[PDB]
Amino acid sequence: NDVFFYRNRLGFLSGENVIMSRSASYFAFFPKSVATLSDADPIDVAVSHPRISILKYAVPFSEQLLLWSDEVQFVMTSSGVLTSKSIQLDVGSEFALGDTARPFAVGRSVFFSAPRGSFTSIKRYFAVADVSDVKDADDTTGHVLSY
Amino acid sequence: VEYVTSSNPRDDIRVVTVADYTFVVNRKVVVKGGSEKSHPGYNRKARALINLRGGQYGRTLKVGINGGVKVSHKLPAGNDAENDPPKVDAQAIGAAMRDLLVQAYPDFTFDLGSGFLLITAPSGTDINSVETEDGYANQLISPVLDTVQTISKLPLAAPNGYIIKIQGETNSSADEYYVMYDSNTKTWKETVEPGVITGFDVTTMPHALIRQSDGSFEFKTLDWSKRGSGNDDTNPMPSFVDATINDVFFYRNRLGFLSGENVIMSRSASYFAFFPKSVATLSDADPIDVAVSHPRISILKYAVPFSEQLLLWSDEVQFVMTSSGVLTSKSIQLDVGSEFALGDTARPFAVGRSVFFSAPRGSFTSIKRYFAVADVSDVKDADDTTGHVLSYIPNGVFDIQGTGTENYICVNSTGAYNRIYIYKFLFKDGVQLQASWSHWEFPKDDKILASASIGSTMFIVRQHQGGVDIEHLKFIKEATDFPSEPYRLH
Amino acid sequence: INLRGGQYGRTLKVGINGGVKVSHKLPAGNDAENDPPKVDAQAIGAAMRDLLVQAYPDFTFDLGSGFLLITAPSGTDINSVETEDGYANQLISPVLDTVQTISKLPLAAPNGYIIKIQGETNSSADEYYVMYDSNTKTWKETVEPGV
User: Three-state SS string across B197-266, please?
Assistant: CCCECHHHCCEEEEECCCCCEEEECCCCCCCCCCCCCCCCCCCCCCCCCCCEEEECCEEEEEECCEEEEC
CA of A29, closest CA in chain C: separation in Å?
16
Q: What residues in A contact C141, CB-CB < 8 Å?
A: 33, 35
| Cα separation, C140 vs B345, whole angstroms | 65
Alpha-carbon distance C97 to C129, whole Å? 10
Count of pairs with CB atoms under 8 A, one residue in B, one in C: 56
Which residues in chain B (1-30) have CB-CB distances under 8 A to chain C?
Answer: none
As to burial, measured by CB atoms within 10 angstroms (0-12 exposed, 13-18 middle, 19+ buried), residue A136 is middle
- Is residue A18 classed exposed, middle or buried when 0-12, 13-18 and 19+ CB atoms within 10 A define those classes? buried
B349-378 residues touching C, CB cutoff 8 A: none
Q: How far apart are CA B286 and CA B238, in angstroms?
A: 13
A35–chain C Cβ distance below 8 A for any pair: yes
Kindly report the length of chain A.
147
B185·C123 Cβ contact <8 A: no
B377, B405, B479 member nearest A118 (Cβ)? B479
Say which of A48, A95, A133 has its CB closest to residue B19.
A48
| Contact criterion met (CB below 8 Å) for B472 and B453 | no
Q: What CA–CA distances, in Å, run from B313 to B302, B320, B334, B337, C1?
A: 5, 9, 12, 10, 68
Minimum Cα–Cα distance from B17: chain A residue: A50
* Strand, helix or coil for residue A51: coil
CB proximity B169 to A under 8 Å: no
- Residues of chain A in contact with residue C125, where contact means CB-CB under 8 angstroms, are 35
- Chain B residues within an 8 Å CB radius of A93: 352-353
b/e B78-116 (16+ beta carbons within 10 angstroms → b): eeeeeebbbebbbbebbeebeeebeeebeebeeeeeebb
B436-451 residues labelled b (16+ CB within 10 A) or e (exposed): eeeeeeeeeeeebeeb
Using the Cβ of A134 and the Cβ atoms of chain B, whether some distance falls under 8 Å is answered with: yes
- Are the C-beta atoms of B47 and B118 separated by less than 8 Å? yes
Asked if A53 and A16 count as a contact pair (C-beta separation under 8 A), the reply is yes
From C3's Cα to the closest Cα of chain A, the distance in A is 30
Contacts of C128 in chain A (CB under 8 A): 33-35
B472 touches chain A (CB under 8 A): no
Integer angstrom CA distances of residue B160 from B40, B180, C46: 16, 9, 32
- Give yes or no for a contact between B14 and B169, defined as CB atoms under 8 angstroms apart: no
Q: Which residues of B touch A146 (CB under 8 A)?
A: 477-478
> Cβ–Cβ of A118/B404 closer than 8 Å?
no
Looking at chain C, the residues that come just before a C–N gap of over 2.5 A are: none
Distance from CA of A129 to the nearest CA of B (A): 10
Q: Does A34 touch chain C (CB under 8 A)?
A: yes
Q: Is A138 helix (H, G, I), strand (E, B) or coil?
A: strand
With beta carbons less than 8 A apart as the criterion, state whether B357 and B365 touch.
Answer: no
Using the beta-carbon criterion (under 8 Å), do B91 and C84 form an inter-chain contact? Answer: yes
- What radius of gyration, in Å, describes the C-alpha atoms of chain A? 18
How far, in Å, CA of B87 to CA of B93, rounded? Answer: 8
Query: Distances from the Cα of B390 to the Cαs of B366, B402, B418, in angstroms?
Result: 8, 22, 21
Cα–Cα dist B306/B355, whole Å: 9
Q: Which residue of C117, C126, C147 is the best one to mutate when testing the A interface, meaning the one whose CB has the most A CBs within 10 A?
A: C126
Using a CB-CB cut-off of 8 Å, the residues of chain C touching B185 are 96-98
The separation between CA B38 and the C-alpha centre of its own chain, rounded to angstroms, equals: 20
Nearest Cα to Cα of residue B367 among B399, B405, B337, B325: B399
Distance CA B152, CA B166 (A): 11
**Helix %, strand %, coil % of chain C (to 5):** 15, 30, 55
- Which residues contact residue B105 at a Cβ distance below 8 angstroms, ignoring those fewer than 6 apart? B65, B68
In whole angstroms, give the CA distance from residue B72 to residue B141.
13
Q: Round to whole Å and give the CA distance between A117 and C92.
A: 85
What b-and-e string marks burial along A31-58, b requiring 16 or more CB atoms within 10 Å of the CB?
Answer: eeeeeeeeeebbbebebebeeebebebb
**Within 13 Å, how many C-alpha atoms sit on residue B111's CB side?**
11
Pairing of strands B147-148, B109-112: unpaired
Cβ–Cβ gap C84/B114 under 8 Å: yes
CB A75 within 8 A of CB A63: no
Query: What b/e sequence results for A78-101 when a residue is b if at least 16 CB atoms lie within 10 Å of its CB, and e otherwise?
Result: eeeebbeeebbbbbbbbbbbeeee
Phi and psi (nearest 5°) for B7? -115, -25
Instruction: List the resolution, Å.
Output: 3.1
For the stretch B285-319, what's the b/e string if a residue is b when 16 or more beta carbons lie within 10 angstroms of its beta carbon? ebbbeeebeeeeebebbbbbbbbeebbbbbeebbb
How far does the CA of residue B15 sit from the closest CA of chain A (Å)? Answer: 10
Q: Which residues contact B419 (CB under 8 A, 6 or more apart)?
A: B413, B439, B440, B441, B442
Is there a contact between B221 and B203 (Cβ–Cβ < 8 Å)?
yes
- Contacts for B352 with CB less than 8 Å, ≥ 6 apart: A93, A94, A95, B404, B427
* Chains in contact with chain C (at least 3 beta-carbon pairs closer than 8 A): A, B
Question: Do the Cβ atoms of C88 and B183 come within 8 Å?
Answer: no
Q: In which element (H, E) is residue B95 found?
A: helix B90-104
Coil, helix or strand for B374?
coil
Helix (H, G, I), strand (E, B) or coil at C2: strand
> C interface mutation test: which of A34, A36, A41 has the most C CBs within 10 A?
A34
For residue C1, give every residue at least 6 positions away whose Cβ sits within 8 Å of its Cβ, in sequence order, or none: C14, C67, C68, C70, C81, C83, C92, C93, C94, C95
**Residue B30 DSSP symbol:** P
Please report, for residues A140, B82, C6, C10, the alpha-carbon distance to residue C28 in angstroms, rounded to integers and kept in the order given: 105, 6, 12, 9
Q: How far apart are CA B318 and CA B336, in angstroms?
A: 6
Identify the DSSP state of B446: -
B476, closest residue in chain A (CA to CA): A117
Structural contact between residues B311 and B302, judged by C-beta atoms closer than 8 angstroms: no
- C28/B151 CB distance under 8 A: no
The C-alpha atoms of residue B253 and residue B109 are separated, in whole angstroms, by 56
Q: Does B53 touch chain C (CB under 8 A)?
A: yes
Do C22 and C63 touch, CB atoms closer than 8 A? Answer: no
User: Which amino acid, one-letter code, is at C113?
Assistant: Y
Q: What is the DSSP letter of C128?
A: E
Query: Whats the size of chain C, residue-wise?
Result: 147
Distance CA(B406)–CA(B391), nearest Å, equals 27
Q: How many CB atoms lie within 10 A of CB A117?
A: 16
**DSSP strands (E only) in B93-206:** 109-112, 116-120, 130-133, 141-144, 147-148, 163-166, 177-181, 188-191
Taking the C-alpha atoms of residue B421 and residue A44, their distance in angstroms, rounded to an integer, is 46
C-alpha span between C87 and C84 (Å, rounded) = 9
Q: Which of B305, B211, B321, B255 is nearest to B18 (CA)?
A: B255
Contacts of A72 (CB under 8 A, 6+ apart): A49, A51, A53, A91, A93, A94
d(CA A40, CA A37): 9
Closest chain A C-alpha to C119 CA, distance in angstroms: 10
Q: How far apart are CA B113 and CA B51, in angstroms?
A: 10
| CB atoms near residue C109 (< 10 Å) | 20
Give the Cα separation of B128 and B149 in Å (integer). 18
Nearest to A116 among B250, B405, B478 (CB): B405
C-alpha angle B439/B440/B441, rounded to 5°? 130
- Identify the closest residue of chain B to C25 by CA–CA distance: B86
CA nearest to B61, candidates B92, B83, B86, B84 = B92
Q: Tell me if residue B326 falls in helix, strand or coil.
A: coil
CB B155 within 8 A of CB B144: yes
- Please name the amino acid found at residue A6: Y
Tell if the CB–CB gap between A94 and B352 is shorter than 8 Å.
yes
Assign C98 to helix, strand or coil.
strand
Q: Please classify residue A65 by burial: count the beta carbons closer than 10 Å to its beta carbon, then call 0-12 exposed, 13-18 middle and 19+ buried.
A: middle
Q: How far is CA C52 from CA B1, B27, C24, C40, in A?
A: 67, 71, 11, 19
Considering only CB atoms, which chain C residues are within 8 Å of B115?
Answer: 88-89
∠ CA(B120), CA(C12), CA(C132), 5° rounding?
105
Chain B partners of A130 at a C-beta cutoff of 8 Å?
374-375
A–B CB contacts, 8 A cutoff, strictly below: 65
Name the minimum distance, in Å, from the CA of B335 to any CA of chain C.
Answer: 35
Residue A131 to chain B, least CA–CA distance (Å): 6
How many residues are there in chain B? 490
Task: Count the neighbouring beta carbons within 10 Å of the beta carbon of residue C1.
Answer: 19
Q: Do A131 and B474 touch (CB under 8 A)?
A: no
**B177 to chain C: which residues are within 8 Å by CB?**
121-122
CB contact under 8 A, C86 and B86: no
Chain C, nearest residue to B116 by Cα: C88
Q: How far apart are CA B301 and CA B245, in angstroms?
A: 10
Contact between B17 and A52 using a beta-carbon 8 Å cutoff: yes
> Are the C-beta atoms of B418 and B441 separated by less than 8 Å?
yes
| Among B472, B458, B459, residue whose Cα is nearest residue B405 | B458
Burial class (CB within 10 angstroms; exposed 0-12, middle 13-18, buried 19+) of B240: buried
Name all contacts of B285-288 with Cβ < 8 Å and 24+ positions apart: B286/B329, B287/B238, B287/B329, B288/B254, B288/B263, B288/B264, B288/B327, B288/B328, B288/B329, B288/B332
Q: How far apart are CA A137 and CA A130, in angstroms?
A: 16
Backbone region of residue B21 per phi and psi (left: phi > 0; alpha: psi in -120 to 50; beta: other values): beta
Say yes or no: B78 contacts chain C, CB-CB below 8 A.
no
Chain C: nearest CA to B311, how far in angstroms?
36
What are the beta bridge partners of residue B469? Answer: B462
Residue C125 near chain A (CB below 8 Å): yes
Q: How far apart are CA C120 and CA B188, in angstroms?
A: 9
